[model samples]
Target: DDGSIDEALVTVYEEIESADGNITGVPSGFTELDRMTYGYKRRNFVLIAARPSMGKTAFALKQAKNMSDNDDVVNLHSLEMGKKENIKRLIVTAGSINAQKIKAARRDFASEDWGKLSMAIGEISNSNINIFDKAGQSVNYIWSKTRQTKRKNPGKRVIVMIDYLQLLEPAKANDSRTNQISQISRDLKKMARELDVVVIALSQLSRQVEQRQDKRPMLSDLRESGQLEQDADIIEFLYRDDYYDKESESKNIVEVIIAKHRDGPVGTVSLAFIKEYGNFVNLE
Candidate 1:
């Protein structure tokens, strides 16, 4: 037997605190949520998952808008939706308009609120909100493109986001769906740490949530593999009361469950969901 004992877990407290001129990074726009998780730190993989129509896409878009507006460098790659659709969400998030109207009206946006819509899109464009919606991009293709962008735009931190994990494919699609998702999760975490930017990824929950009365998502509900939980430094789940037809005076309570926080406490942060604007507000 030539197997040797090895120390696996390593912990160290480094003294490289920020010097002057360093900006404090914070979450997208929700202050309460930021306080709850100490802000999504750089070099971290934050996974946001929830059931269908739970506002996961909207929340992730808000985070991207935040990073693109605040961070010097940012990149977003989406699989579920195309670039145009994601851009519409960003524009919609910047204003107080229902997505259904914009989606239904499509080109007729000018007939209703053309001025406001145009203004919002122009404002969002000012931000560094770059997006790539490659339908079936391999993990290697994504990494390569991001690296190229980083090289082209030097001296700026890059915040990378993937719409959802399950859609990303391996170089070869021989692996099962679950195995492919697991590999994507593993690569995202490594890319986050290596790129020195906060990487936020969205995921889909299974139909199992439909059977539960509460339907509040947990870490175990993350479909595919446990690798998502194992790889992500921070795991956030989005829950909307309207999903369950719960009566409320106002549609403001968006439940942000800190299901898995490796560095801090686990709890829920309340935020107001503006379905019209596709954005969130601090629940006072």
Candidate 2:
């Protein structure tokens, strides 16, 4: 009984202590997004939700590239694309190369284009990043792999990103769809805490988002289980006015809506989405 009292006080003191001189968390490279979220804090479970073809995966990849340049280790799981395909997109973003040009191998590349592509490949090769393109991976499998990775790289900052949440195979076969998703949500939160890393999970929004006059998504628009809202420490949605309004004033602008932030303010941060290069950059 006496030992329990001492242990409780130590835990409380550590929790209340200030990080007076230390960097609090990892930055996502977008200045405004970094300022709003105070970067992605350790033990944080973040949900990036958006409708299909809204640059959710592209945004996450951009963040991963940004973080990889730092001392952070980024582990990306692409349920939809293979490693080669994902790396090709990364190269396109890094090199500012046109998607069509890369897709067409028959075309001749300019000298400048060759330089950019070479530099992109060199940078990616030197980075501390790993891409997992395994199809139909269960949440449990992801946790196990991440846990092992953390053990191997002690004290290094780690970031686990899932391209999209819906594609994750459920751990339990007999469970209902909603319950299975709930379990995945809970497990992601648990892994973030246990591994002391940041987890950014991409999610799809319900089709009802397009039905409304203002297509800007809301918390209720999150697809599947409500557990996403409950379990996520931060929830953001990507919105583009140009998608619905062709003559929209802000062309090629993606609004990152900070819908739910457990520890800070909620607002919107706009980033420039270069669709041609499949990249998201800080607004000019």
Candidate 3:
């Protein structure tokens, strides 16, 4: 046991030296967040929590697209939105087109818009991104699918993203909601370690976040389970000032609050949010 521990220490030391203490883990698509967390580490569970309509799904989708673009195999499980809707979102995000125009196609598409859509389709079709939009999916179902994906891909790096955690059904039907969520959180953590993939799950913050004066989320704002705090290696909250104050100074900006980082410093990363395309990009 000591020998194995010593070997692990050596491996970690060698890795740190090779990368010069920089993040050599998976790329999160946002440079600032990557710098802060050393990139979402492998075999770790990550939680992204926000209030309803705070753009958690959009943010996570943007990250998933980025990771997939970097050649990482990404599996997205969406419990709330439908498969067609998510594909439309991907098209809107990739093409930078107006979502309303796509939704209400009463008129003919403009030439430029058509061109952009075609290009987006080409790029997305070539990427290693998989979407599963089944409703009320259980944690075990996600785990099984991920394992199957890994086996199919062989040596490719895998990243699994859950649209939101609260929607996950527990393995046991008779359990209380709190107990179910607790078990689900633990299972996600164990799955990440066993499968050696980064697991990022979105969550909803408690209503108390809105009642507060500042309205920024904290560790206590996590809904359903205290086990979420204990299970996650990284916990991030998405906050948009415009959601609360339309006249606030920060317009079209999102603050990624890193409330907890298991192995690094905690801080907030500001990003630009494009509402039209439902995209989050690095601050210019």
Candidates in order have lDDT scores of 0.76, 0.87, 0.88
lDDT per residue as tens, model 1, 158-270 = 77778887777764578777787788888888877776667888888888988987788977787667688999988888888776776754366688898988887889987
Clashes of 3: 0
Residue 70, candidate 1: Cα error in Å is: 1.0
In model 2, pairs of residues that clash are none
Clash tally, candidates in order: 0, 0, 0
What's the TM-score of each model vs. the native?
0.85, 0.91, 0.95
- C-alpha lDDT of candidate 1 relative to the true structure: 0.76
Candidate 2's C-alpha runs over 4 A off are 1-23, 106-111
Which predicted model would earn the best TM-score?
3
The candidate maximizing lDDT is 3
Better of 1 and 2 by lDDT: 2
What lDDT tens digits, residue by residue, belong to model 3 across residues 26-122? 8888998888777777787999999977788889889988998889899999998987888888889998888877787716644458888888888
Pitting candidate 2 against candidate 3, the one with the higher lDDT is 3
**Candidate 1 segments exceeding 4 Å error:** 1-23, 98-101, 104-112, 248-250
Better of 1 and 2 by TM-score: 2
Residues forming the 10-long window of minimal summed lDDT in candidate 3: 103-112
